[PDB]
């Protein structure tokens, strides 16, 4: 519930998605949906609409609490975790663009999980149900993203991916039940060491990297609160 209005904020894309889910390939205007210029947006689009939905609702309102619990009751986020498990695994540029396509899949589904844990927006433990921690412990997302967690060229390749990882770690640091899921904090110490190494390189010779270091400090303070 509540997904409908946010889907109606993008009306033509909503019509294309609803025609594909009803099983027709055409829009009635003489053009196929797959041949339309919008069709690059539609594979990542419901994740975008869901991320806008989860950012739109706060944790304080009871409708949001029922919304998170309804998301667990459907288990669509479990199928998100299944997709992340199967997706965590010619031309060189074409294969790189394919890996980019799964990379914005990680970015959009991971924006979904980051907005699911913490609503963020302008900016509680009993409001979130307890079973989602257990099913994320069952999910192989956390070891896979810890492997995805080293080189400044590596963040230079995948900027939206590392941004989505960083806001996931900020959402985990925000929640009290998610700090057991991270080990991963020592790996985060390794990337903030890598950020300091690139700081040494710029002392020898973007704006996102100090913010990555700051969010790393935030999650490190969360690990200190966990150890305390």
């Amino acid at each position: 519930p509540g997904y409908a209005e946010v889907l109606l904020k993008e009306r033509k894309h909503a019509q294309c998605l609803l025609r594909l889910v009803l099983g027709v390939t055409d829009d009635g205007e003489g053009s196929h949906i797959l041949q339309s210029p919008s069709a690059n947006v539609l594979p990542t689009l419901p994740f975008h609409v869901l991320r806008s939905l989860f950012s739109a609702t706060p944790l304080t309102t009871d409708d949001g609490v029922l919304l998170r619990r309804m998301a667990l009751e459907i288990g669509a986020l479990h199928l998100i975790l299944v997709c992340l498990s199967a997706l965590s695994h010619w031309d060189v540029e074409q294969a790189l663009t394919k890996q980019r396509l799964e990379e914005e899949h990680v970015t959009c589904l991971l924006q979904v999980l980051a907005s699911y844990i913490n609503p963020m927006s302008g900016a509680n433990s009993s409001a979130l149900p307890s079973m989602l921690l257990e099913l994320l412990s069952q999910s192989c997302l956390i070891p896979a993203m810890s492997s995805y967690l080293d080189s400044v060229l590596d963040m230079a390749r995948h900027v939206p991916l590392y941004r989505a990882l960083l806001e996931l770690l900020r959402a985990i640091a925000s929640c009290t039940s998610m700090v057991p899921l991270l080990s991963v904090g020592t790996l985060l110490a390794k990337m903030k060491t890598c950020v300091d190494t690139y700081t040494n390189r710029l002392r020898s010779k973007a704006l996102l990297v100090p913010d990555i270091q700051r969010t790393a400090e935030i999650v490190h303070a969360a690990t200190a609160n966990l150890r305390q």
């Binding site: 099983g23 027709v24 009635g28 003489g30």
Partner: protein, 98 residues
């Protein structure tokens, strides 16, 4: 005695039904019948959608009766608006017949 050249041979067509009959070699068939019924319903739905859009497109068309020389010049020129309308009719009719 033929001279050497490039040879283009049409391979033709082969028509047959899928093996679902048990007695023809020498329940699953009921599930296959239900799947066939659902497939017939889906193809009927898409065909009815094509018929509706073709009917609206047919209502969009005017046709002169060749009573005058102006209608004759309309047939002779074949204007590009009539060309794009006839192309839309050709596409919708091909979808309908398939």
């Amino acid at each position: 005695g033929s001279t050497n050249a490039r040879a283009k041979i049409p391979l033709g067509f082969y028509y047959g039904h899928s093996y679902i009959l048990p007695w023809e070699s020498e329940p699953e068939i009921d599930q296959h019948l239900a799947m066939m019924v659902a497939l017939q319903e889906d193809i009927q739905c898409r065909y009815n959608l094509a018929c509706h859009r073709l009917e609206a497109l047919l209502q969009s068309i005017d046709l002169p009766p060749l009573n005058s020389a102006n209608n004759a010049q309309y047939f002779l020129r074949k204007p590009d608006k009539a060309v794009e309308e006839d192309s839309r009719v050709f596409s919708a009719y091909q979808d309908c017949i398939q």
